[PDB]
Design a protein around this nucleic acid. Sequence first.
DNA 1: TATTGCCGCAG
DNA 2: ACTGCGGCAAT
Length: 60
Amino acid sequence: PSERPFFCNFCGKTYRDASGLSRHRRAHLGYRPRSCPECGKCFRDQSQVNRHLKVHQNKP
DNA sequence: TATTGCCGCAG
DNA sequence: ACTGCGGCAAT
Ligand SMILES: [Ca+2]
Ligand SMILES: [Zn+2]
Ligand SMILES: [Zn+2]
């Protein structure tokens, strides 16, 4: 009916759409171009940097 | 064909 | 607590 036609050429993992595959490929590559300005830790995109930022709040 | 914002799932 | 993951929508 649930098709996962996009797939990785090094491990065959399948995806519903091109976005999951884009992210998966970049994860194999270690391509994490956006970094936390506070600690330097790198993430795949700005959204994931932003989610990380709360690490740096004083707890509670 | 591409990238990421948004945000939920799971460990 | 923290983050890898990935579906959907938008672009
Ligand atoms: Ca999901
Ligand atoms: Zn793969
Ligand atoms: Zn940080």
